[PDB]
């Protein structure tokens, strides 16, 4: 956050814990909104042989 | 009835019939006309006792395999409809119905097509499959569809344009054709594929990997 150090001390004292360690707002540690494409593997039944439907 | 079956009937009636049974093994009696073609020194049509060993037939009448017996690679014993056998089986096999059934190929028409070690065996089996594709009458679904399917698969196999798993797939495709058609043309189209897969799978896999690393 962009809070002044004295305000951080006042907040920490009032709450009783270290607030800057766990901020509710998300600044930069989140995932990027543009991602590479996936590959998404296939299931067990995607075989070419020994895959008769009556057995499964 | 076959022309050969009909033709021998008067001779069987005259000479005795019990004379006919004196040739060959039990339930494999009489004399047979053999057509030896392919990679032999003297391809020819001959008449021989029914239960003659294949090697003796090829050596005595056809002049032997081209380049010697050690150059033998494969034999289709009874025409294209019969599965082929390698050199290790041709050493002691008898040229009758029951012996060739025990070798998993059948006697068929007693037409011996010989292929030496200098032939592309996959290409020859693909040519047979293409023959069956062009000769299917198209009446029933398994032949009309599966034979053309196997033809395309074998064309891709010849160039190595497949992956090893498809080999098993091809096997199953043939198993879906055999026993499910109206006539035996589907069976006779599936059998050479099964023989090639049974005896020459490493050749298929080697071609596949050569195509794989040749094309990245
Ligand atoms: S199996 Fe026989 S009847 Fe069926 S499509 Fe082929 S040739 Fe015609």
- Could you estimate the helical fraction of the residues of chain B in percent? 40-55%
What proportion strand of chain B?
5-15%
Main sheet overview of chain A: none
Residue share in β-strands of chain A: under 5%
| CATH architecture title of the largest domain in chain B | Up-down Bundle
The termini of chain B sit apart by 56 Å
Overall 3D shape of chain B: globular
Shape of chain A: rod-shaped
CATH superfamily of the largest domain in chain B: NADH-ubiquinone oxidoreductase 51kDa subunit, iron-sulphur binding domain
Elements of chain A, N to C (H/E): H
When the domains of chain B are counted, the total is: 2
Instruction: Please outline the major beta sheet of chain B.
Output: 5 strands, mixed
Structural class of chain B: alpha+beta
> Pair with the most extensive interface?
A-B, 4 and 6 residues
Looking at how many chains there are and whether they match, the oligomeric state comes to part of a larger assembly
Distinct bound molecules:
iron/sulfur cluster
Alpha-carbon distance between the two ends of chain A = 56 Å
- The helicity of chain A comes to 10-25%
What does this structure look like?
The structure is cut from a larger assembly and holds chains A (56 residues) and B (216 residues). Chain A is mainly alpha-helical. Chain A has one helix at residues 5-15. The longest helix of chain A is centred in the first third of the chain and has 11 residues, at 5-15. Chain B has 216 residues and is of the alpha+beta class. Chain B has a 5-stranded mixed beta sheet. In chain B, a hairpin with a 5-residue loop joins β3 (31-38) and β4 (44-49). The A-B interface holds A 47-50 and B 165-166, 168-169, 171-172. Residues 136-140, 143-144, 181-183, 185-186 of chain B line the site of iron/sulfur cluster. Chain A: This is NADH dehydrogenase [ubiquinone] 1 alpha subcomplex subunit 7.
